[PDB]
Nucleic acid binder design. Structure first.
Ligand SMILES: Nc1ncnc2c1ncn2[C@@H]1O[C@H](COP(=O)(O)OP(=O)(O)O)[C@@H](O)[C@H]1O
Lengths: 472, 66
DNA sequence: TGAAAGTACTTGAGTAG
């Protein structure tokens, strides 16, 4: 029943995107894992629920988003499908490839269970379903470790363009005008993502409704259903229509594929949806701070964010850059990209940004130093003569460094023995242990430890030169 | 001080917005941001605005009606 | 050439799935 299932069973089979038919075949033929990556609205429910209807057993789906799981279950119930929501024939395939990825801003999971169920039914369809990007794609090929159904020219329904806030006198007014010359869903950075931006837009006469973590679930469902029937044209969301006149980002997204996913929820039919990106250097540094303190509390995150930064600052087509990022061939796309519509305008804008890049003083200098230095960034073997050698009270003080300082102290003690006739080496071992431990407890940073041991060895040399024995 | 930060008329009806009043010498201006843009607030207009304020709404402003 | 200090006002501004 690769195609004999038809729309009559659930709702679907019409070869939505002709390889959509093969999307069933890619599962029907059992071609291991097929990298299904298509623009939103592609009927992936046909791709990975038809085998769920046709599996000899179960086809457990990894759709973390419980609300998403329940919505899928009920929408398929409207299509008469034996699917059950286990969230909180089908029990609710490695679905939601962004769930196992931090780039799709969905790497917020827990154990296996559903994943464990999938590993149990590996004989049953093992599918992976908009993350086919060498960084992200190989992350799926490594972290998840599975044909690429990535769209050949991604999507030409978005008029990608980048406008810099520094160049614009009134970024709020500029985004209001851009929305005017175009429903709409807008994302941005944290620190009350919705509230302030939505208030400013509403003051601009463009009713923007907030969707934040602190908002009530009743508010969430009200704004969602209002946005469904065009009651509220503009909805602001943090990370949470076939028209979607604007998906502009006031601030940069958390991850490159995160930005792709947040801008990829437009044009269900394929109608143009503009889509614009606003970039700020201060925003770049702030998010660099955030990601660095996140990874501190891993290098792929900073590498991909730098890739995003250079993508927003490169002289070339945005679709070409995403092909470099998503691994596709040359897009060869017509007008609809900022460099495609006007290379000169993009080059002039980047040049203008480069030219315009340049108690309050305390915090200003602190932020400057942090932003300008951030971008610039073993147990004792057998017989180490150190007291509590397995300690790290002094940062970046390697045990080999401790051994070297101890050897400097030990040759100092040997010279003191040759000059003052100390007892022997057997108790000199314990004496060196005590001296090094005292120097350890009297210093905090590594340089301070080196300075203190240098001062102590200078004092030992002074005592040896004086001729008196090195007393306590 | 409490009422300056509200640019939107919530409470009661009149869901419309409130302009920014800027004084240039002897002239007032209602610089409507985007909801034309600048209108020289005529004193007859402010007279019409003020004549509608209820007694409660002016006594709370400190101005006794009588 | 060679007034100046306290209180206004007047603006833009400002953390998660
Ligand atoms: N093969 C098809 N032919 C015609 N309409 C379809 C087809 N497949 C899906 N549709 C409709 O498109 C909707 C999209 O479902 P979904 O699987 O969530 O899309 P997406 O690929 O973006 O995940 C479905 O609810 C379905 O009703």
């Amino acid at each position: 029943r690769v195609r004999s299932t038809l729309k009559k069973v659930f709702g679907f089979d019409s070869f939505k995107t002709p390889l959509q038919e093969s999307a069933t075949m890619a599962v029907v033929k059992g071609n291991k894992d097929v990298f299904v990556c298509m623009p939103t609205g592609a009927g992936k429910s046909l791709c990975y629920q038809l085998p769920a209807l046709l599996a000899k057993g179960i086809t457990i789906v990894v759709s973390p988003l419980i609300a998403l799981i329940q919505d899928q279950v009920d929408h398929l119930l409207t299509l008469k499908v034996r699917v059950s929501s286990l969230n909180s024939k089908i029990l609710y395939v490695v679905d939601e490839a962004h769930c196992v990825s931090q780039w799709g801003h969905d790497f917020r999971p827990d154990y296996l269970r559903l994943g464990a169920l999938r590993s149990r039914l590996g004989h049953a369809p093992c599918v992976a379903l908009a993350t086919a990007t060498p960084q992200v794609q190989e992350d799926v090929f490594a972290a998840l470790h599975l044909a690429i159904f990535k769209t050949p020219c991604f999507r030409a329904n978005l008029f990608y363009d980048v406008q810099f806030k520094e160049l614009i006198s009134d970024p709020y007014g500029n985004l209001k005008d851009f929305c005017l010359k175009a429903c709409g869903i807008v994302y941005c950075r944290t620190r009350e993502a919705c509230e302030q931006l939505a208030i400013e837009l509403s003051c601009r006469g463009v009713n923007a409704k907030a969707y934040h973590a602190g908002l009530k679930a009743s508010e969430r469902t009200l704004v969602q259903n209002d946005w469904m029937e065009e009651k509220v044209p503009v909805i602001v969301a943090t990370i949470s229509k076939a028209n979607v006149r604007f998906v502009a980002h006031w601030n940069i997204a958390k991850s490159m594929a995160g930005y792709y996913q947040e801008s990829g929820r437009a044009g269900r039919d394929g109608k143009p949806s503009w889509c614009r990106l606003y970039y700020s250097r201060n925003d770049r540094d702030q998010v660099s701070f955030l990601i660095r303190k996140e990874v501190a509390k891993d290098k792929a995150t900073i590498m991909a964010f730098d890739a995003l930064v250079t993508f927003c600052e490169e002289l070339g087509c945005r679709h070409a850059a995403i092909a470099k990022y998503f691994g596709d061939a040359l897009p060869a796309c017509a007008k609809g990209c900022d460099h495609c519509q006007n290379p000169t305008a993009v080059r002039r804008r980047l040049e203008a940004l480069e030219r315009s890049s340049s108690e309050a003083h305390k915090r200003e200098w602190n932020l400057f130093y942090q932003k300008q230095m951030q971008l610039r960034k073993v147990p004792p073997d057998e017989n180490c003569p150190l007291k509590e050698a397995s300690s790290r009270r002094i940062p970046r003080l390697t045990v080999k460094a401790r051994e070297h300082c101890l050897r400097l102290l030990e040759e100092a003690l040997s010279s003191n023995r040759q000059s003052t006739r100390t007892a022997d080496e057997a108790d000199l071992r314990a004496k060196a242990v005590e001296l090094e431990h005292e120097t350890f407890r009297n210093a905090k940073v590594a340089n301070l430890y080196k300075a203190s041991v240098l001062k102590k060895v200078a004092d030992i040399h002074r005592a040896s030169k004086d001729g008196q024995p090195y007393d306590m | 001080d409490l009422c300056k930060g509200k640019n939107i008329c919530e409470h009661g009806g009149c869901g419309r917005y409130q302009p920014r009043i800027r004084r240039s010498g002897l002239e007032l201006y209602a610089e409507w941001k985007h909801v034309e843009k600048k209108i020289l607030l005529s004193p007859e207009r402010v007279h019409e605005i003020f004549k509608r304020i209820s007694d409660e709404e002016c006594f709370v402003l400190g101005m006794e009606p009588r």
